[model samples]
Target chain A: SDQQLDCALDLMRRLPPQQIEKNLSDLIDLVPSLCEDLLSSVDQPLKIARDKVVGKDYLLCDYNRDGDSYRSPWSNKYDPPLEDGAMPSARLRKLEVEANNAFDQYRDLYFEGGVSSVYLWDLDHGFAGVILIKKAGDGSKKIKGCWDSIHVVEVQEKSSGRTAHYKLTSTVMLWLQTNKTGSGTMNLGGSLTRQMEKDETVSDSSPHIANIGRLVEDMENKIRSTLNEIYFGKTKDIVNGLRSIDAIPDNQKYKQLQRELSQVLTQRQI
Target chain B: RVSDEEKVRIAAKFITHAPPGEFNEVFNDVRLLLNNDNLLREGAAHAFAQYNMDQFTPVKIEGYDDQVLITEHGDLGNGRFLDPRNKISFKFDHLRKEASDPQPEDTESALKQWRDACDSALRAYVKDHYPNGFCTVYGKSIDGQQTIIACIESHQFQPKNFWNGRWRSEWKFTITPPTAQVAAVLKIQVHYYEDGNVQLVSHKDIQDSVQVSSDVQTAKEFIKIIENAENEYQTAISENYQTMSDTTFKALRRQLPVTRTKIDWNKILSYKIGK
Candidate 1:
């Protein structure tokens, strides 16, 4: 039974990122014991990783990873994991160096005034890493903000005959807080799958850079309107449906009600 | 294909029999897994509309001659079950008290005294906290439609670009210069109504904070600030990730902006067949 559960879990992991949750639920319903092991494995990404993965070029998502034959994002090469680590390779730092440059400009245009970092590691197939952006206000005004937007991407290389198959798992983490009344703090995190398996082969930093931006930009906009429609819009409906309404104050309405009540004793044939 | 009613019935039955601990898991599954909130709320409304209460004894209240203590909660054209534990119920001696006492003229004034008291106290607080606002109360009669507690702020806001995750405008409170500082109560209102509902329609000004650099800042310091802020953000996101998980492309957890209790599964689950 444990073997069967492991088999299901193994299959569950490979199902397109969106489908794992529902399939996981189905497996748990069939075998209640599947829940704990399944959820711990599934929810591994949601864990806030504090430990710095020790790098400069790109920050790899160490999402419950073990036994590091860790690929260096700076060099696009895998090295043996060790303490006090090797003095790094004298290899390909060009792509990442360029990536950091382009993405900084990207951050400038997108955020107007914030910082950005792009990290890329050599995954077994194509590549994977995280892009981290931070935008904090100058902080003297009545409303201030500190924002962190992260996109962790894994682009696994596959083959579809002539055209290259690049399957990307995009996880976007957005945290936004404001020092404004009514508009409260928001922490938004979601992941989705994007396939660039169209009529194109890929190279370093061309398709790769464009694709990551493409994915993040789409999800960024989508999540905004989604928050508005889902959270703000629905709560108003719930509140309105809960009770009813009234109007703004005015002298006439106020005195009119008072006059009627005053005439209540007079209306008894005074 | 099964009928929508049948689907709704199945969901209600599943929740009714679900284990307490696995409630979130199962509830999340059926809702996100099998159905969206349209069905979820539809199912909730169906359960609320149909279920009969065997739990509580019925009691009469002053306003509704034909109303029972409990009947149904949803399928309201949507809803609100008039709160069973209302202060007015306590004030009028409708509900039994520890001391079997009666409202003795101004005893009825005790009701207004609360709104009256709450108004004055709230007024003093705004002034004491730095009087940018004033408070007032309306509704002289006990049986009036609504009682108002108003805390009126005299200033408007200036819009600043919000640097949060999204590109949006955040409205900032503009502090106005005082004209000898003596201002009338412009009447900002927090309305408390007959059905034990409170709708706060005014903003209570909170204290402001500003950071000044004690020393010169460097590239490393700026980078460090961003890094720590991001880590703190992640920590907060992960901790609150279980509020409501949207199981689509990944897990999404949206925090509840307003305070509310967990859905009452027990109330929605059971029914009475006979007396």
Candidate 2:
């Protein structure tokens, strides 16, 4: 029975993130006996992990069972989870760093003099998330505001026929603060799925893992493109501007985008 | 150029003789003329007291249902006679429209457009007035009629070293115009936060008696009215901050519980056993 449960979880994990909901519903329909246990054990844990990773408020260090062996290579002494086995891999780590840097720059441009609290949640086996909490004015002032947002990414590798496929699922939740008397505040939620074939142009001498860098770059572009579509009505130069984060000027275009994002966050439930 | 009596008599003649079209202008001119001299002004005021009483004349507008009576009497009856404080009051009779009238075309897109416009108007008003505040829209369906409400709120926390209290206020702008009979309205609520609890201290409707059509122009006017109401309420709170704080503190003290309950070990054991 334990083996059967493990097999079901492994099969569920292999399904594309977009198909998980429908596939799980079908599986439950076919086998009603496994419904309660599957939901309570596998599905619940996965959902909790996904949310915790996206929220970035939970601890990630020392929680990994493999410990020092799982550390990432690109990580430093300050950021202890850089050991290779600890993170998604070298490429995912690089993408996470790049995205976090871009997000930090964007927050600075939007909030200006305000302060932001940042958190990183790393779930081993190719899943990670980041959270940003931003506040605008001093507490005692007549006008003050704050909001929280979470972005989570999962990278999975699978074999289709002879070639390998790299799939990335990115989920974002923007929780705009409201004057709610109790619970259940409205928030924006969306997910983007992207898949790409492994690159074949790498040198024979290069390590097999080097091909992942190209996939990561592609994934980064898709994420930025989705964000652009949500914030701006079109995607003219957002990808290019995101590529060179430092060179992007703090101008009216960016300000308009920021205002539009704020408007969407406040006005629509999404 | 004439004697005071002659001037008073001339003013009276002007007030009585002017045509209905020029009546307001002539009355204003006579008042201004009398105001130039204190004796004439006092005598004119005394003489116009009876005319002021007779100023309540029933007037009818093309679109309104009932006849309105306009008067020079102030609402509180404390204003001077020559001051001419005009008030308009409407009188309604028990006449209801028949249900046999054909219903207007229900353009779903037009309703959506009006709803979106109203939503934008409220958001723009809130953003303009409270740049650093927050807002959320909530929708409710009552008796098959859709009602959308936006709650815009702003808060000011106490100083760092000060006691734990804050000033909070919310503006609830609601639009529920399923038919011509219903009127859209906005409400303002001022709350006080003390000891980690908030209490509604002041609440009132903004222009409760005024009704507006579900159009862009009316929505814009409603936004202006809400802005004005918010500014007035904020000013009032600022002027009476100390009194409000004291009252809130007293209320908090009165809310303190006199007794506390202990954990029920038997109930907890029963729940555990049942589970």
Candidate 3:
């Protein structure tokens, strides 16, 4: 009887420690799965909303820092009648090349690795332009920008089908220069944010502040789901597994106990 | 300002070599494709690359529910339907309406029409022409509701193949509005690999566009640039076809720019400036 009392006290001490340890493990274990469930529930709808917001339908213009005025570069200054083929003055060509080179080089680095195109517009000049890059890593290395903006502006001679060529005419405007400097004015419609987020890579781990938390949440959820499946049963696993499990450092005894329990579970299933 | 024909031509050329399917057609112009939006100014550069006179094709293009569709068939390929490259970007920006300036209230209605039309068209076109290809419509729309602008791109095969193939195709063209409040000007340039270099085939000047404008000087300018760019590009390609290595030149000739319509110098320059 006296010996039984000693054994009971030992078991009592171990139970509290084990229970405390199990509680902690359970909480940690649930975190990821819970996060994943939350993210999955939120991701689809949010992604849908996000996708809907981003697009190529934006304006490109130059903004005056002082007055905040916008100008349209394609004004009526150069209107002409329909002709078979025409040409531009050397002046316009020079400006086009210069702007293209400037913008292209910048975009190359900005979009590095995984981009196929970029659009440029000077809010001040009212000049709008686009850049079609060969998806990043093809082979031929050319320093020259794809083509001058002015050159792209010359393709209107052919025929006008009913619909506007979105690729050729769909230009967008951003309120914040990538630097976030300038007029300090943001796109009132929040269109820029939508466009950038939509255009970015889903696999990227970079710090896109707006989407960072959401991405992390998603990733964390995945890890948790994997952990849950490995350690606990879906719902009951949490309760049953936690009810018996404990965290005692990774020593020999802990390893032995884990091995024994794993065997028991396997044998029971068999 | 570029013409729809030119855009279609370019899309046709690009899609001709692309794998057929609903998701992998011609790559639509995303904001990242736009110049000034990001570093490479993809949109502007792509527009610039399309300026070559020989590169233009006439086709109808639309974006519904985050999908871009290109319609029409010529030397580029047969069996017309909107391409899916235009729609892939919808994972970024959802589809939009057709109105030049859409109101918020019209978003839902316009989107409904766009998605419905796109889905129906995709099913009908693919089923009629490419029954073997897998097609799936991935957006939504409601009657009378206009959502975000969605651009559609067409293709006869899946996209994954094209991406894995040799030399990712780059086709460029411009789109000009039929009637503009002001004379709209557009220029196109094609940046392609030729003679071991990324060569640029550009309209000599934006002013070389053939179409003339009555009220808007910009439109006249657009005309000159379009006309000139076409002529210049054709000349270059023709020269390459005649003078370049047989093996390399043949591959290049297969491109849309090399095979499309004959160069119409006069028609290209027909547009005049208005008083």
Candidate 4:
């Protein structure tokens, strides 16, 4: 078995450069599609959590509205300290100003026409942990990269009689390699958990809540379908395409060599 | 002494006229010659020229067993070959040892032997306990610590909900001992599918024991513990399938929470109503 494994390694070692490059290219192309497909489900225009923008190219929290003040979806631990009437601490103010300024710059450079990249890291599973994306060629072609781990979670729960809640969260990153080179990468870290609850008969809730809920619910439905299509449906196509060249079966020579090696080992045992 | 240019010419000719399907073997021989510095720079150049006849560029293939280059002259384009620079090479040293006998001085060999033994024992235990079920065993060693994972899977349906699928009970046995003593723990993990998602609902450390040494006596003791744990865990799952499924459902529900977003009417009105 070890010899067979070694023979497999030998066959892999003999693969042509063009084949390797093709595999790399396919892997790269998948990254952007993965991001686009996941993000396209967000039918509603992205709402900026202005205060929660921590640094240049950094969004610390998702946009949220709770009671009078707009609260970020993130926990209070990361929330900036609020001073009572008096001028906010100078250091904290500077950090906030810098963060906003950096965010604005990032928006212009990356979010606008400039080159950008994103990443996804799943800590629970090691294999599908790191995914990297970058633009290649004339900005038309994007290279999607992953060091293996790519898994998504979706949950559906029965709320009322006919209503159900759908929640989906995905953590991935995008990097714009050519724009500012390597330094121009942004870590798009946040779980996109969209919850949709629908009642069979009456659709009336708080007017604003209903409006926002409808937007996210629509987005969640579309996103869920798109991801499901990819994870459940199209992954086979992608895997097969890559495997056509990448998955090399053992040849006759390898088998013969393995047999010879096994016989030698057998003789040595006696 | 042969001229470098002439040697190159010969190497080139040999490669260009290489028989069909024998290129890899012939190329290996040529590579060996190159590695010994027997082939001159011109020979190397000509060899590459012959290699490029097919217009194929070399690629590096990395695998668990060995690292190899698929290229003309076996060069990775950086002028590095797979040959050892040192005068002494240990390529066949592993083959020199007795095939079935592990050296007592070698810790890695001993660890591997013990891991194989543990895997065999676990397989037997699973076979005896769940005759109709299937079990797959795999082992990995890291930093002198060996971990063996045995996944015992079986099909079972809930009463009324025959739509509910099979169950997976995994036993992860981690054996990491600092000295001759074997410290191990067998962890039981139960998983079931809900709404097409595999959810791990319950996990319990069913056994924790230390063997004084890796010997026949200790191996038997470890195998007995594994057998008992497997039997007990299976019974627990059989009697409490509903409870386990409910627990998984509860866990899945806990993961799904409501996400709220704020609506800025002023911003919306500013875009449409005012402007």
Candidate 5:
């Protein structure tokens, strides 16, 4: 069982790339081609980046309520040991609780899908928050699939003007998809049959899977100012570029920049 | 280091393009750096303000409502002072200290005393500050226990560019000559209730010495000055870059003019909801 679970987790970690592809696909599906409105929307680019492998929509998660939902996993024990009557150790019990809670909350906000991810600062302006994803539609009742126990990821915050940019260091939840349908097979008796096999596998919960949860914790300790500067400093490039052209003659330079700007605008992609 | 030729060329370019719509903002900036060892900033402020606000005579006053009267000594007046037209009239009212049975003549005496005090202060202030200019006092009124002040000044002392076609006058004490003097007021009216001691009542009859001066200078001068500055800046920008693309040239062309026209101090002074 442990081996199976580990294999599932491994699969979950690698899913970020797939998620990115899926996200792009979804965006493309929305419009047949890039239009003026879409181009304009992305023209003024946001410097902050979320891990594309995990999901672009991760930013839509609400940070407030989801944190509490994931707290349970960190306290729960995985299960009673198979070899003896001994209970899970205090450490194991605590981790189990934490993992379970984290997974549950992560499933609610991130894997399931939600409107948007909302970010907030902790009491000390720390980067502990939650992500939310919308729940999938089911026949009658909705059931959530837990890929991993509740976990913590480190988030770095940078403030540029009115809004702050946040980057995720670890993923608290993992996303897993199962291939339920087994194709037709043939036996020696020439009897054709199909079987349903439980293909329970794990992909790294997106881009953060490689580092596990430790990387996220490390992110929490990073210098906020430096992190912010790295992520949000892209705007300076445009301003500086404009400034460099100040030495040119007014009429000639104006015309030159205008032409250059048009070309630059035409080649922009979001 | 801008050469004299370049500076003159810049000024010429600005003068050529300066329009009426956006001179106010430019005038303010130019005023700050009009004179320097380099001609670039020299005479720019003064020239811009003159172009924008126009070469109108400056008016310095205190507490006169310059918006309602004009300065001209004629017919019912003598000297270069405010001349009230037929359309305007002066009225006075005196409220005694809880003495309803007071005679009308007593009230008139009180009014005369108050008017004389106001007139003396006005003459002294103007004579000392505006030695060559003359001012006039017209409307006088008494409320509760206090008197309302009103007056007007001649066009010679006021900024004539602001007069436009309207009837206007300056009504404040003039600042001393040889310096850029402005007319302004220092005191205002207040009311109090009669209850043995005293309780400040509402300011029911606060009258400013009405000087009907035109706002044309503020609007016109501001536009002229700013537009000139913009043209200068634009010319400088253009001369530095030649053989530019048509699109680039056109874009620059479009932006410079637009920027010049958009320079409005009122809009700038107003609060912006979102940048």
Candidate 6:
């Protein structure tokens, strides 16, 4: 009986990413006996693994979320929520200023075109902020890309704390619609994200810029790479999976073709 | 131009980032990159305003009836069957059907006639493709600018596969005909209604432009563009719709259609644990 349930779930898990909710409902209707256990297991909550780093605890939701905002670790409250009157201590305020200024320059040079924004709010102990990047690519360019990435992070130091806790939650949204002209538009839309958090044991002597800036820079760099690997790389891979790019398959490569062909029948490993 | 909740954060950020008064001392040869429209002019203010100023924001109104919204800031809200992002921003000053120079005594009637003819041309074009379809084409001209809001829907349904629904398309453009350039945009959405909760839908944004002319016959040619675009877009979106359902959607809900083994649900249900 348990074996049957596992088979159903494995099949569901192997299903393509789109329209999963409806797929589950359809599956339930097929075997009325399996409905209770099937729904229960499918709705089971998945917990993110917490690595040893800046945060006390990290609660992460699906990274490519469209609506529900992330929680701010510093305030222990909903992000983009109502702001408390508490201001960042003078020292933290300067950090916000420098962060914004430095990132403004970074956005200009890096994006070359598009919108980049940094918003930082004061936490009771430290500070939390969000970086919003949107590039609604222009058709003016023959080949173009458009993307939106939301980066929410918090840097905290407790009153008696020795190490600075850096907690982050974010996702990269990619919208690439490349068009040559008149009815020739290639539309590819997707988003990806993974866990990110860091810590720096501080002595309070060195300027905070080097530590925090390095942390934020590393964070962005990885996300950019993640976007490259996940979205960009996967698109090319999926196409190749669909059809071999080369016109001819070498006659000698029977084993390679069989392996690739075998994958499609069982379900390509998403 | 910021959210009420984020206003304080914005103010604090602006104070720190823009430096209202710190420019008094460390203001190295003050360079204020000034521009208008609270819009992007240079990289400086454009980047500055992303978090600082949300001058232009779009809102979605759910549970509302379908309509075309040709907004000043190009906010074409969601449609029942039209692609929401399929929108255009045109600021037009002229139409070729109207006389370039009309006598004051005949001006109002001449203008009225031209508008009616424009409407008729669009309706007639839709009638050709979708005999059961209706066109709601609204045009407004003022201060050397004309904004057109048009939506067309076919009540006639196409029965295909597990669904049967109608086709709908919308266009919004403002024309500064003196320049003969129109920022015209089009959206085509295909809706297929199956029994009960099962339904299918797909959307596409058709791109286009129209050149104005002094010829009286020019206006109908403009409608002809709509005809050509809808034909191509309807074909494109419909093909994709079928592909999505047949290839993409079915890939998920894969059935062992071969049916070498059948698990008889009727007999299986009859013999339950309680029995």
Overall lDDT per candidate, in order of appearance: 0.35, 0.34, 0.24, 0.31, 0.26, 0.41
- Give lDDT tens digits, candidate 1, residues A1-270: 556455544343322222344555555664455566665334222222222354443333332133454445444444445454322223324556555655665555455555555655575656665665555554553333344455566665665533243443333333222323322243222222222333334544335555555555555555444443332233233223221122122246655897789678868865
Model 3 chain A scores worst on lDDT over the 10 consecutive residues at: A185-194
Compute fnat per model. 0.00, 0.00, 0.00, 0.00, 0.00, 0.00
Docking class of 3: incorrect
Model 1 alpha-carbon drift over 4 Å, by segment: A1-94, A158-162, A169-199, A203-207, A218-270, B1-275
List residue ranges in candidate 6 displaced over 4 A: A1-95, A112-114, A135-139, A181-183, A203-209, A244-270, B1-275
lDDT of each residue in A102-140, candidate 5, tens digit only? 433333322232222323234344234332222222223
lDDT for each residue of candidate 2 in A214-264, tens digit (9 for 90 to 100): 343344445444433432221112111112212223256755888789778
Model 5 ranges with Cα > 4 A deviation: A1-93, A96-214, A217-226, A230-232, A236-251, A254-270, B1-275
Q: Once model 6 is optimally superposed onto the true structure by TM-score, how far is the C-alpha of residue A142 displaced, in angstroms? A: 1.8
Q: Which candidate would rank higher by lDDT, 1 or 2?
A: 1
**Real interface contacts reproduced by model 5, as a fraction:** 0.00
Q: After superposition, how far is residue B102 of candidate 5 from its true place, in Å?
A: 76
Q: Residue A203 in candidate 4 has what lDDT?
A: 34
In Å, residue A92's CA in model 1 sits off its true spot by 6.8
- TM-score, cand. 3 vs. native: 0.17
In terms of TM-score, which candidate is strongest?
1
Residue runs of model 2 more than 4 Å from their true location after superposition: A1-164, A178-189, A197-210, A232-270, B1-275
lDDT of 5 at A85: 27
- Candidate 6, residues A98-126, lDDT tens digits: the string is 65545444444445444444546776787
* Candidate 1 C-alpha lDDT tens digits along B98-183: 21221112224433433444344434433332212222232233243322222222211111210101011111111122211111
Q: How much does each candidate deviate at the interface, measured as C-alpha RMSD after superposition?
A: 20.4, 30.0, 31.9, 20.2, 38.2, 24.7
